[PDB]
Amino acid sequence: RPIIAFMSDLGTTDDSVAQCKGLMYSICPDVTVVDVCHSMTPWDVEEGARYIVDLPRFFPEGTVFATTTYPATGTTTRSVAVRIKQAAKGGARGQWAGSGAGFERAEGSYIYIAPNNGLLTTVLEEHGYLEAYEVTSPKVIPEQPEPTFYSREMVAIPSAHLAAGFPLSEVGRPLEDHEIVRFNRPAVEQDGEALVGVVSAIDHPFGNVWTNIHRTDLEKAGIGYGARLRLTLDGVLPFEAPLTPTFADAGEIGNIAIYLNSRGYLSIARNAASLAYPYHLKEGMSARVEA
Amino acid sequence: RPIIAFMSDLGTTDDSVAQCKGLMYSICPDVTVVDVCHSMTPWDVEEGARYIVDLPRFFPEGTVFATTTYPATGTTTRSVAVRIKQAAKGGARGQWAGSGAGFERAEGSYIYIAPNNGLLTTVLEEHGYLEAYEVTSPKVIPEQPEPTFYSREMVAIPSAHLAAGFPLSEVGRPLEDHEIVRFNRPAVEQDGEALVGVVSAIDHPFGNVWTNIHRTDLEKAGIGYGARLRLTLDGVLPFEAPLTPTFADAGEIGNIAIYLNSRGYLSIARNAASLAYPYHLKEGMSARVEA
Amino acid sequence: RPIIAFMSDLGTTDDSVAQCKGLMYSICPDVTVVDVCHSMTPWDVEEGARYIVDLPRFFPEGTVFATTTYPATGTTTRSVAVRIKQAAKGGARGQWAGSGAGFERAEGSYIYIAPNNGLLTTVLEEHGYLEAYEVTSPKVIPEQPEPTFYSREMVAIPSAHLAAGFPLSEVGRPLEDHEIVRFNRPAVEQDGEALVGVVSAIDHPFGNVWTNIHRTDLEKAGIGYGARLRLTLDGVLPFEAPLTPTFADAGEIGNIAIYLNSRGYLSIARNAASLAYPYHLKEGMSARVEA
Amino acid sequence: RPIIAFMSDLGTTDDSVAQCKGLMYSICPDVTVVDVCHSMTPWDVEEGARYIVDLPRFFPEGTVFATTTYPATGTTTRSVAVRIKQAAKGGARGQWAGSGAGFERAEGSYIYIAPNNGLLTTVLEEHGYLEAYEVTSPKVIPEQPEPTFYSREMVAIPSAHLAAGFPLSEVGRPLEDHEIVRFNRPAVEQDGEALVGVVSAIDHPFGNVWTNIHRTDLEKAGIGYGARLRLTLDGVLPFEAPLTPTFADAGEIGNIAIYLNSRGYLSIARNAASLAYPYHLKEGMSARVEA
Amino acid sequence: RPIIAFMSDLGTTDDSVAQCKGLMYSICPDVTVVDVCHSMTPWDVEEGARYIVDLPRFFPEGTVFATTTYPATGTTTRSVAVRIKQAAKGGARGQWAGSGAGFERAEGSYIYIAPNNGLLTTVLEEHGYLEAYEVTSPKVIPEQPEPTFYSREMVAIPSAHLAAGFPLSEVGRPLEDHEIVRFNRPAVEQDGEALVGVVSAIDHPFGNVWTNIHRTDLEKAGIGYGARLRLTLDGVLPFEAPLTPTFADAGEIGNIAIYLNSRGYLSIARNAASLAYPYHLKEGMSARVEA
Amino acid sequence: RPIIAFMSDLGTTDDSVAQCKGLMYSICPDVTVVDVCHSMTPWDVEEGARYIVDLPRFFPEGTVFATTTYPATGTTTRSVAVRIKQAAKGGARGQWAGSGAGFERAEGSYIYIAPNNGLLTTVLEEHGYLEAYEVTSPKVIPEQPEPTFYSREMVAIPSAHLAAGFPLSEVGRPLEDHEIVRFNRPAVEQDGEALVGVVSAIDHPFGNVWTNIHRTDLEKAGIGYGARLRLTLDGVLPFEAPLTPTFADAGEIGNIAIYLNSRGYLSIARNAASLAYPYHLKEGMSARVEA
Ligand SMILES: Nc1ncnc2c1ncn2[C@H]1C[C@H](O)[C@@H](CF)O1
Ligand SMILES: Nc1ncnc2c1ncn2[C@H]1C[C@H](O)[C@@H](CF)O1
């Protein structure tokens, strides 16, 4: 029952994703292919990252993560292939995933395959890694790769060999740490008592606002559930509510709820209504909070 | 070969669905996960209900329907699970689905699991049920659930256990009928011989206007195939046409067809052209039909 | 363990595709269903052609291609089922797909089933065929096909039967060639050394511009990589760049690239930036190339 | 104390109209300049015609009408200047404008100056003319007319001269009739007792729908106030109402009104609500009327 | 030097306003016609009101105010004609208009002519009145009024007679107070210390937000210049700034300024940037303030 | 016959302009008020400057130009007033305006009054000046000005006094040159023989693209009428065309014209079709031109 979780920027409007899928079923007949999603803002390693980092704990051990935006397609760049260390708890409390106490996942049990363009930056910081190879072997990639379609040549295809039990260390030479491209995560800055950060995501389709202030940033400024907070966005729009577990706590439909999202981050929303869209709020806007 | 049929309001823009699925594969390795749709209007129970009500006859026996919009996530609210009675024929006519004379489905052959928020109103109505349980049990749901993701935790996780043969009656206590939340279906009123309903839906991607006026309503208003009909939408836009079985019956491309859809409800369209988009006709406008 | 590749115009916003999937698993329990796409401009056979013609080389032998837009749903028309001849190499060079030198594919190995309305013009033109049959037999279509849903009834259902091993030849009588509807393909003309075409397509979600000026057309005015081209779009927009394999080749982000796409056609784009979106370029605009 | 009525396509977003106004006050210091409108769809002579043809009855005798869209600005074309014959009654009944029984207007009393490009087709057709002259004399146009600004040079400037008393006959040689460009006016056809036209216009800012089915056309299939009409728009939209003088006559706010507009043409609207805006109705759509 | 200030809902895209203007110049040759504006949301007596109430003090004594939205056009309704009592100070301080100490305007010096549909409600409350007549005399209105164009028949035309020195009391019978239609102004409600009201206007094109909380509501809750205020809109969006005279006081460009507008009302804005549009704020949204 | 030429950013949606005008008529009863435009981009000095710089030659002698965007309203900032020196020829060529050989204007014949915010940068440049005064005096401005309406109080009111013959030198103290705020005009740089400017404006309503590249720049780049030009906008969209005097010179409707506008700046358009709107070309994009 080998599984591939597939995340790309290819979209769902044409056959691009189907092609990789065919090659996946062709290379590894027992495989199950799981779409993560294919709508990510193209060439955006940063937004890509957030769609792939929280996945491991949800998935059966042995799962192979094919994750690709490939703006450097057709050049001499080459994919990176890594077994991650810690499967890693997550959520708003930090716990394993599933029924009961959740399923605990053994160490070193997932492999990510991706452009070496910093797509994995956060996956690496949060899960760490056991081993890292450059994807070069003609047994796992095409001899004559489609110049403009490396997401399929250099990620979808070798991912399937990986699903079909190809020895990881045979994909190419070991990559050393400095050789794995990284993107810079900007930090939560202090400023008085207030923690200062940014809107990381509009949580579609609900229109919820996610921020890059983690609970750890919060529960280290001594902010916990129950505190009246002032959250200011775009520099100009203040908001006031207690930090609550979820949306129905804000009371009436339309009320403002400040919560920790399912990925562990400070968030703000309207209770059963969209916050972002009516006010046209967006990713990258400033976001400051204080008790 | 267990089937989970999954209908959510999670959208396909991020990994929300993939996290559910991965856990589905974790709990039930042999399962097949089929996406119904994932794009329904957020928190819109009535809408969610149309995408799920019609499915049973189409699926093999023992299929689990994971159907979910969860605006009460994080509350002490618990899910509901039901084995439905009649799989029920459908379409414009009232026939079983499939090749030849259609395949019949044994009774008591499909389990719905959903928020107990009224999402199953029309399923329960159209299908009846044999049993119904509150989903409280720590063997099928998490001990500490993510307060913002009850679609994952109270729907996605349980359904995989049920697909994998977890006894339905052991998920929690027997709910009675009154404990199963309903929304009441606004009924087709009547002025003279005219019938007064609503645009229940715009049929994407085609722009076909679906009304809440069912075959049964037309029968015993005396309205059969070939009756010349005057139908008015939004109280402003009239259309005159005989009731035909299909679009091409209109004649010239772009002509008005009045018809019964693959669900058996009164509908209007242009033939091989889009009706609702040029006219910006939306869900919920009044729908009136005289002969 | 057979595969159906499913392409329609049904959208992913309601339960329609799912319904087909349900019957596919119902008739052929061991099938894997692979979504090609379901977002094609409705009733646009030429567009639907694009999303299916390149598929066969990517799928294992025995894959069944279920391809459908049915404006004539509810009429006396019946689908056509065909065994293609050549699997066809493809892409920019014209080569097998896969790792190594690629998965060479045997002849006579894929079946397409489709409305008989020219959806398979391209597929035939490019792959040839071995046999063709009218899909009529009630062993593979309903005796009472739902008038408005021929894509489920006359394509999905019989695809499932074929996939499971229903012999192709038993679907109904064989079709003589002139009975297979084709649409006209506007050809690439010549003017001086220039080539005159159209914008076949916008490459979503990126915004690349696709033409119907194939490499064979190019390789017949002598045009290869590194040639200083002038590509005029919409009759008023000269573009001037070398023909290059990939986007990075243009240098700086946002620069103009003239390349051959993964399908083998002359195209134009910007290096890691959108060409079509800011300037609202569209399918059907004039396309001209010369050195 | 003379008046120039100024209609152009120049917009009101820059200093362009002002520039003309400046020269008007410069050459004829005592002029009053009256803005007709300057928002007409650029280069659309038929549209520009609408905004000028009804003017003369509303203005004192001696008013000069400066009317201009000049796509041919910078060429050898020269404006035409004409003294209209009949001032023309107008409106729904056909009557003089003003208090009491209205300001009866003497014949030969208004001058139009315009590009010779059919802008005055309607005005001539409906008012006749007494004399016509090519505007050439350097006493009334620049010796070096700004190539791209003929509306200022070949219309505004000479309008100012005429207004001040420059004799019409001295502007240049007289034009024979065939030298006065007209565009074709599609006429109102007949079918049974029905009348077949178009939507001449959207009545901004309200959203009333205007047709080219005049009252004379109506008064020739015998159609008067109180007649039960069926007005079909865009070929698929029957509308059914009596012909009535004003909007209130339809009863409730939002109801459908069929009336004769202030220009004398059959129109359709809603009582104190917009018809055209919600349903995106447009100029050029088919219009048909019958009792 | 008689002046007419003209306010309507007729728009600037067609010749409608020109027509009234011609009749105005025809009836009263010495008149100067001053457009107030013609873009007011059609049929909106409430929004109309705000465009006409502050005008008197700006204008030469004797000025006649023609102000019209006429949704009851063509019925037996008839305009109202009134000399207002107090010219009335205004602004944010309350003062006469102009250089020095401004120009003080004698009492009973302006006349408004308008539909009797409550257009004048606020003009009457704020300026009071000396005398009021119904506009019925055929010497000042047409004998056969254009049914759909009463703004010109029943306002523009008699306004000009009024400008030309027609005795006011000769327009028709005296109207008694109850006979002048009024619209209801909703009040500023108290709620703790906070005054509760509503967004009356987006101040176009700057995108400023105006409210219906007057200074008098403020300077009676003891709120003056210098107080830190909390202004909440749409129920959800709080704002915090001191009440300041103008926008540059907010400091940086983009900063929030809470001010008294030029009409004397509590307002909020960004300093040299739009507040309303980026957040899509609008008229009629709730607005609450507290010190 | 005093003329006030009035250019504001007040817009024509409300009565802001009418309040200015009414005071203008109050102070100077014989004045004629001519609207330049009122719709310029709010607070945009550079833009405001293009609508005002070109006007002098067009107007009679002694015309006062009220020109105003006032983002510093309410500050201690005071207006500036200037008698300009040269009225200055213009257009593509450098000619006086009007019929025959154009009318010449005496020097020192027009007064600008404006915020001293740089709005008069290009007026002062193009015209020079003889005198310049800070507008501080309580005989021409209010003793207590409305803090939000300095366009009315520091521009509209003064200008009417100046129209009515209030001695220019008595409005306040003599400002010197350095006290007159300027914005520096971004200059046409140069790469090889190519010229690098900006889209200075989109010419509404036509969609004509105006660049900052002036005739003088083209002369002594050696570029004259009939030179074959390659012009690139936004660094992406090239256009090739000979320099022609006007649009019709392009040939077929819709063809590319490269030309000099009624202001003498390099420009590009389609012939009698719109260039900027289909392509969404906006003000401020790079403008490059090689021969
Ligand atoms: N225009 C473009 N420039 C650079 N990279 C691009 C591009 N359009 C698409 N891509 C990348 C993005 C896809 O993930 C990759 C698959 F091969 O190709
Ligand atoms: N803004 C919101 N208010 C209330 N409930 C919300 C919400 N955004 C999302 N949800 C609910 C609805 C989703 O189906 C559920 C997933 F478990 O979380």
Ligand SMILES: Nc1ncnc2c1ncn2[C@H]1C[C@H](O)[C@@H](CF)O1
């Ligand atoms: N409005 C329409 N007119 C003609 N054909 C239509 C239509 N809307 C959908 N269809 C076709 C296209 C779908 O694939 C098929 C269902 F089988 O029905």
Ligand SMILES: Nc1ncnc2c1ncn2[C@H]1C[C@H](O)[C@@H](CF)O1
């Ligand atoms: N792009 C254009 N092509 C042809 N004619 C145009 C044009 N833009 C504006 N015009 C015409 C229309 C204007 O009224 C006239 C100025 F006198 O110039």
Ligand SMILES: Nc1ncnc2c1ncn2[C@H]1C[C@H](O)[C@@H](CF)O1
């Ligand atoms: N559709 C309409 N219903 C009611 N009144 C309307 C209307 N369209 C325009 N009007 C009114 C609005 C105009 O002010 C008035 C001028 F006569 O006519």
Ligand SMILES: Nc1ncnc2c1ncn2[C@H]1C[C@H](O)[C@@H](CF)O1
């Ligand atoms: N939001 C705003 N910020 C700064 N200044 C503003 C503003 N809205 C309007 N103004 C200025 C600009 C106007 O021209 C001036 C009128 F006197 O008031």
Ligand code: MET
């Ligand atoms: C807030 S509804 C659940 C889905 C959401 N995208 C999440 O990650 O939690």
Ligand code: MET
């Ligand atoms: C009417 S076209 C077929 C698909 C459609 N959404 C349906 O349910 O019938």
Ligand code: MET
């Ligand atoms: C240009 S990125 C690769 C996918 C693209 N849609 C293609 O078919 O080639």
Ligand code: MET
């Ligand atoms: C319908 S309101 C009156 C003005 C309208 N535009 C007309 O010309 O009749």
Ligand code: MET
């Ligand atoms: C705020 S800028 C000045 C114009 C505005 N509409 C007002 O009434 O004050």
Ligand code: MET
């Ligand atoms: C080029 S068409 C004439 C009007 C234009 N706005 C100009 O200034 O020239």
